[PDB]
Design a binder for this molecule. Structure first.
Ligand SMILES: CN1CCN(c2ccc(Nc3nccc(-c4cc5c([nH]4)CCNC5=O)n3)cc2)CC1
Length: 340
């Protein structure tokens, strides 16, 4: 059993030549040689059996990716695990090997306007497939966007994905959340559960501004701070947008704040395209109801060279609807039986 960095990697004998790529809350990811397809693939090892949360997460990403088939979404090539459920301690997801991700790329590389336009288009065209299936990613950030040597982009990490529920979206002021603090929509800290498609649009807006400056645009250090910088740039929300917030604690918080004017995008990005900034403006809209939809974003004059309505597929079968840790270990076992 090949061992990488103090950990075991039972992916053999079909997968050899292990090379550590990283670690995190998703698991451990390595690059391996598929002796069967004669190519190098990426293998995500996951050990979610001890905790229920880690178990459902493992289940949500297997179900979704096994059904999703899109050029701008990473897929599952194989699944490796024990043949019996008594010996199943880990799970191994075999996926296409990519060169880098947008997180690493932005840390060192200045992006050209043509690159920004192309990357954004592949983000919206793939997100459109995810939304046509009635699913929300809820974790769109540069680390979840994989790139290859030919600039082909790909979305990652469906563990926090959910079926859209607009009728069950309202919550109290400052309710607990998990999605990264920097790509969090303003309504999340005010009155939302993040069950709407408009939360993904916000995240894509944040990623766009990041590609333009190479610096995060709203880098809040905690839950409320995040809301404060969103307001430093966007300014104090209008009467109309406030009247939209019926939650008293949220509304009253916004009213207690001194007036802040909008920092124009041309001032934050004086070297950006007039169109890219117009689209950014529409994605980063304080009011979730006036925020641009994925199909409208694709049709924006900033993506006219790539925009094809016939070359942007939609999901064949959308998800109809959205337990102990021992139950979720049998669902996974039966979901991964296909690859045995
Ligand atoms: C400093 N590092 C240098 C190397 N970079 C790199 C980044 C990506 C890849 N290829 C690759 N192929 C297939 C899957 C993945 C992958 C799935 C997931 C993640 N990655 C992280 C977040 N959650 C996931 O579920 N990645 C290769 C190298 C990372 C940054």
């Amino acid at each position: 059993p090949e061992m990488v960095r103090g950990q075991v990697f039972d992916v053999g004998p079909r997968y050899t030549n292990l090379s550590y790529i990283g670690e995190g809350a998703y698991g451990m990811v390595c690059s391996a040689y598929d002796n069967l397809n004669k190519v190098r693939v990426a293998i995500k090892k996951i050990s979610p059996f001890e905790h229920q949360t880690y178990c459902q997460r493992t289940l949500r990403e297997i179900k979704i990716l096994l059904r999703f088939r899109h050029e701008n979404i990473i897929g599952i090539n194989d699944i490796i695990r024990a043949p019996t459920i008594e010996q199943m301690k880990d799970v191994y997801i075999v996926q296409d090997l990519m060169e880098t991700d947008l997180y690493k790329l932005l840390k060192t590389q200045h992006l050209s306007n043509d690159h920004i336009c192309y990357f954004l288009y592949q983000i919206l065209r793939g997100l459109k497939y995810i939304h046509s299936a009635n699913v929300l990613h809820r974790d769109l950030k540069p680390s979840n966007l994989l790139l290859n040597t030919t600039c082909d982009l790909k979305i990652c990490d469906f563990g926090l994905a959910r079926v859209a529920d607009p009728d069950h979206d309202h919550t109290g002021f400052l309710t607990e959340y998990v999605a990264t603090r920097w790509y969090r929509a303003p309504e999340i800290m005010l009155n939302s559960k993040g069950y709407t498609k408009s939360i993904d649009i916000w995240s894509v807006g944040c990623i766009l501004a990041e590609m333009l400056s190479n610096r995060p645009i709203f880098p809040g250090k905690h839950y409320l701070d995040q809301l404060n910088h969103i307001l430093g740039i966007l300014g104090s929300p209008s009467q109309e947008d406030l009247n939209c917030i019926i939650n008293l604690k949220a509304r009253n918080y916004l009213l207690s704040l001194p007036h802040k004017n909008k920092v124009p995008w041309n001032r934050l990005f004086p070297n950006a395209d007039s169109k890219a900034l117009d689209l950014l403006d529409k994605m980063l809209t304080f009011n979730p109801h006036k925020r641009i939809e994925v199909e409208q974003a694709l049709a924006h004059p900033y993506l006219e060279q790539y925009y094809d309505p016939s070359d942007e597929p939609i999901a064949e079968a959308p998800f109809k609807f959205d337990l102990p840790k021992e139950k979720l270990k049998e669902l996974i076992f039966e979901e991964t039986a296909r690859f045995q």
